[PDB]
A paper describes a structure:
Mitogen-activated protein kinase kinase kinase kinase 1 (MAP4K1) is a serine/threonine kinase that acts as an immune checkpoint downstream of T-cell receptor stimulation. MAP4K1 activity is enhanced by prostaglandin E2 (PGE2) and transforming growth factor beta (TGFβ), immune modulators commonly present in the tumor microenvironment. Therefore, its pharmacological inhibition is an attractive immuno-oncology concept for inducing therapeutic T-cell responses in cancer patients. Through its proline-rich domain, MAP4K1 binds to a diversity of adaptors in hematopoietic cells, including those involved in T-cell receptor (TCR), B-cell receptor, and cytokine-induced signaling. The function of MAP4K1 has been studied most extensively in the context of T-cell activation.
We found that replacement of the pyrimidine with ureas such as 2 increased potency 10-fold, delivering single digit nanomolar inhibitors (IC50 = 7 nM). Protein X-ray crystallography confirmed that the urea moiety interacts in a bidentate hydrogen bond with the Asp101 side chain in MAP4K1 (Asp112 in the surrogate kinase MST1). Despite this increase in potency, selectivity toward ROCK2 remained a challenge. Ureas synthesized from cyclic amines, which reduced overall H-bond donors by one (not shown), also displayed more than a 10-fold decrease in activity, highlighting the importance of the two hydrogen bonds for overall potency.
Author numbering: 8 to 26, 29 to 36, 39 to 159, 175 to 295
Write the structure that this text describes.
C-alpha cells in the first residue's frame, strides 16, 4: 500500500458508476480505473489490507489486474485495469441477447480466470454478467464487486459466517447461470422474489434450470448448462475439466465474436 492523495499520480477523467464509486483515470499516460471506497468511523484498515494482499498476487489476463492501493483522508482508492465497454450486462441491455458462439468465447475466458483463481485456492463468489468486463479489444476480465453481532456467535456459526458454504465449484454453477443470463437477458427466476428462490433451491426435488428455447441452441450448449448446473458439488466438474467441454474448446472462439458485439452496441440496424 501507499498512503497519499492519488490525485498527484493520476488525473480523474470521468465517473463510470456508483456502489464505492468508479472513475476512469490516466497515470505513463495509460488508462486505469479507480474504485473509491468511503470508510466510516467504525471501519478498521488492518483487515482490508489482508483482502488487498489477495488482489496483488492475482496475475491473469482473464482477471482485472490490480495495480496498487492508496489510503487518503478517510478514503480508500484501488487502481485497476480499464475495460472501456463496461460489463456484459451493460452490453446485452443495449445489444439484446448474445449468440451461442459469443456466449461460448465468454464462457471459455471466465473458465480460464476461474481455473487460475481455484489454482490459487481462491473463489470468485459472485460470477454474473455484471462482473464480466469487456475492453475496447473485446477481451474478457472477471471483476471484483465482492472481496475488494459476532460477540455472541459460536465458532461454527462464526466460520460459516465468513466462508459461507461457498466451495470453488459454486463458481462453475454460477457460470452456468451466467450463460443462461447472457442467452435470455435474465437468469432463472428473476421475476420470483429472492427468498422464495433460496427456499425453492433446498427442497429434495429441485430440478436444476435450463434454456427456455431448445431448437435455438446446439446440443453442446445444452450439455454445458446441464453439466455446470449439477445439484451435487461432489459431482460438478472443475474449471480445468470444463475447459475440455466441446462448447468452449471448439475452434473459431476469439475476441472477434465480441468485437462484433461492440460494433452491434454502436450501430443497431
Ligand atoms: C465489477 C463492477 N461492477 O460495477 N462496478 C464494478 C467495479 N469496477 C471494476 O472493477 C472495474 C474495473 N475496471 C473497470 N473498468 C471499467 C468499468 C469498471 O467498473 C464498472 C463501472 F464502474 C460501471 C459499470 N456500469 C454501470 O454502472 N452501469 C449502470 C447500469 C445501470 N443499470 C441498473 C439496473 O437497471 C438498468 C441500468 C460497469 C463496470 F464494470 C471497472
Amino acid at each position: 500500500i501507499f498512503n497519499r492523495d492519488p490525485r498527484d499520480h493520476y488525473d480523474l477523467l470521468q465517473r463510470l458508476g456508483g456502489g464505492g464509486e468508479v472513475f476512469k483515470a490516466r497515470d505513463s499516460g495509460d488508462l486505469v480505473a479507480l474504485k473509491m471506497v468511503k470508510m466510516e468511523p467504525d471501519d478498521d484498515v488492518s483487515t482490508l489490507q489482508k483482502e488487498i494482499l489477495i488482489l496483488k498476487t492475482c496475475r491473469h489476463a482473464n482477471i482485472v489486474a490490480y495495480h496498487g492501493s492508496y489510503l487518503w483522508l478517510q478514503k480508500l482508492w484501488i487502481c485497476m485495469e480499464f475495460c472501456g465497454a463496461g460489463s456484459l450486462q451493460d452490453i446485452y441491455q443495449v445489444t439484446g441477447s448474445l449468440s451461442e458462439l459469443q456466449i461460448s468465447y465468454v464462457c471459455r475466458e471466465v473458465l480460464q480466470g476461474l481455473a487460475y483463481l481455484h489454482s490459487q485456492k481462491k473463489i470468485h463468489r459472485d460470477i454474473k454478467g455484471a462482473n464480466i468486463l469487456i475492453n475496447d479489444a473485446g477481451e474478457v476480465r472477471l471483476a471484483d464487486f465482492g472481496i475488494s453481532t459476532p460477540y455472541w456467535m459460536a465458532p461454527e456459526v462464526a466460520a460459516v459466517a465468513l466462508k459461507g458454504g461457498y466451495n470453488e465449484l459454486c463458481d462453475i454453477w454460477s457460470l452456468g447461470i451466467t450463460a443462461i443470463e447472457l442467452a435470455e437477458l435474465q437468469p432463472p427466476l428473476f421475476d420470483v422474489h429472492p427468498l422464495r428462490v433460496l427456499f425453492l433451491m433446498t427442497k429434495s426435488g429441485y430440478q436444476p434450470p435450463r434454456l427456455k428455447e431448445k431448437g435455438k441452441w446446439s446440443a453442446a450448449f445444452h450439455n454445458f448448462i446441464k453439466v455446470t448446473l449439477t445439484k451435487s458439488p461432489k459431482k460438478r466438474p472443475s474449471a480445468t475439466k470444463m475447459l475440455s467441454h466441446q462448447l468452449v474448446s471448439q475452434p473459431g472462439l476469439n475476441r472477434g465474436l465480441i468485437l462484433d458485439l461492440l460494433d452491434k452496441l454502436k450501430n443497431p440496424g
